[PDB]
């Protein structure tokens, strides 16, 4: 059993996971990432406000029993969930080919 | 119809999305994020190697027809997929409460 990732704590754009519980859901327990700071944590450990922590969104397939309280075989649905956070700036940067492909 | 996020291009840990296609999959077209650089792009637009771009992993529910080539009603499965990348360092940083809750 491998140790669950600590990226949420070591990221320059750290996040906390919030539990979402509903009986009309599969999985019933869903973990949503909420960015810790508006800014990003620089190399020195300080918050820089010329950078922003933004949540990465993903469309997840969840099972919904129609009519309610009837689990067997039906049709599922899609829901947007925040998986983690990334650090952005207002600039689209361009960097050489030798730094690429990793 | 809202413009799909450009975080993959403005992130300090940028990524590219690779298409995964299989007839025994729902959704059949899956987008996997692959980190562009080993390092992270600093504020100046340069690659810093005392930081690392790491992919954020998420467990997605995918439909698998058993026996193959029979779509109607059966039992689905879980698969780990890379959604995007984040910037990490070897240090777990600690920052004051007024910079928190955002």
């Amino acid at each position, epitope marked *: 059993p491998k140790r669950s990732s600590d990226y949420y704590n070591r990221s320059t754009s750290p996040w906390n996971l919030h539990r979402n519980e509903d009986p009309e859901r599969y999985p019933s327990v869903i973990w949503e990432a909420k960015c810790r700071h508006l800014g990003c944590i620089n190399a020195d450990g300080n918050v820089d*406000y010329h950078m922003n922590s933004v949540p990465i969104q993903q469309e997840i397939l969840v099972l919904r029993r129609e009519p309610p309280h009837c689990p067997n075989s039906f049709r599922l649905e899609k829901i947007l969930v925040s998986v983690g956070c990334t650090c952005v*700036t*207002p600039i689209v*940067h*361009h960097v050489a080919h030798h730094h690429h492909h990793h | 119809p809202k*413009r799909s996020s*450009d975080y993959y291009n403005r992130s300090t840990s940028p990524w590219n999305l690779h298409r995964n296609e299989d007839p025994e999959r729902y959704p059949s077209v899956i987008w996997e994020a692959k980190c562009r650089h080993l390092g992270c792009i600093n504020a100046d637009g*340069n690659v810093d190697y005392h930081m690392n771009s790491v992919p954020i992993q998420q467990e997605i529910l995918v439909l698998r027809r058993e026996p193959p080539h029979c779509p109607n009603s059966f039992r689905l499965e879980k698969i780990l997929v890379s959604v995007g990348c984040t910037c990490v360092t070897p240090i777990v940083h600690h920052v004051a409460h007024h910079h928190h809750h955002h």
Partner: antibody, heavy 127, light 109 residues
Framework: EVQLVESGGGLVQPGGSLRLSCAAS????????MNWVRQAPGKGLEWVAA????????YYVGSVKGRFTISRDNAKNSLYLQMNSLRVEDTAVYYC????????????????????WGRGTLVTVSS | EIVLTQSPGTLSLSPGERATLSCRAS???????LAWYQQKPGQAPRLLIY???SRATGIPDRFSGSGSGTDFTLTISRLEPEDFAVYYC?????????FGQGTRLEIKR
């Protein structure tokens, strides 16, 4: 025909608050990132704060951390700067500015430079 | 933070003369993302150049820019009375965006 008009400036004592407004006209306001740029009397230009199209991202200069808040109302074509705990060194003319952007294929590319400026509003912080 | 140093502080030339304005960055500016602004007294700045060498809309041919990395230049091939103002360079290749302290271009008589 395109214009940015700032208002809200005036005299305020140190430790005081002031809200600046910028009215945008002649263009699709929601298509652009906007910034506040200031200039102390007889001095140079200085970046204050940036905001993206839908206000999901807000950026600030080091000196205004926790004191200033940038916001926008796309339906009212307005930009705002809430200035709290004002300091004497905040005394300046504040400019509302529009950022240049490009659309390559179906991708929006923001560039952090200003193709349109307002006339500015004088903010005096003094006792 | 990239620090932009402009030279000279004041430039005294007559209409008809060529003007050379310098902007030196403390560190290399990504993708030559350097802009120039003209500001006349009591007025807001006005964009002249972007991307080190490209003219903004409505800017006449006498204005030209060049340079890369850390060294950039603004040239006015033949000065007209209307060109006497303060000029600021601004970089947008590094976050945060920063400006030079300006060069004032005054009429030599």
């Amino acid at each position: 025909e395109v214009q940015l008009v700032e208002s809200g400036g005036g005299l305020v004592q140190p430790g005081g608050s002031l809200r600046l407004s910028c009215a945008a006209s002649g263009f699709t306001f929601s298509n652009y990132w906007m910034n506040w740029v200031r200039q102390a009397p007889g001095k140079g230009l200085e970046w204050v704060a940036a905001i993206n199209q839908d206000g999901s991202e807000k950026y600030y200069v080091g000196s205004v951390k926790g004191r200033f808040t940038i916001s926008r109302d796309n339906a009212k074509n307005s930009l705002y700067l809430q200035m709290n705990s004002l300091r004497v060194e905040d005394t300046a003319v504040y400019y509302c500015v529009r950022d240049y952007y490009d659309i390559l294929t179906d991708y929006y590319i923001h560039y952090w430079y200003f193709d349109l400026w307002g006339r500015g509003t004088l903010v005096t912080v003094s006792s | 933070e990239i620090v932009l140093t402009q030279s000279p502080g004041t430039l005294s030339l007559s209409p008809g003369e060529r003007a050379t304005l310098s902007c030196r960055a403390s560190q290399s500016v990504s993708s030559s993302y350097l802009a120039w602004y003209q500001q006349k007294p009591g007025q807001a700045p006005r964009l002249l150049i972007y991307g080190a060498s490209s003219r903004a809309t409505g800017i006449p041919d006498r204005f030209s820019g060049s340079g890369s990395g850390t060294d950039f230049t603004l040239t006015i091939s033949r000065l007209e009375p209307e060109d006497f103002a303060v000029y600021y360079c601004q970089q947008y290749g590094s976050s945060p965006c920063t400006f030079g302290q300006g060069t004032r271009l005054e009429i030599k008589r």
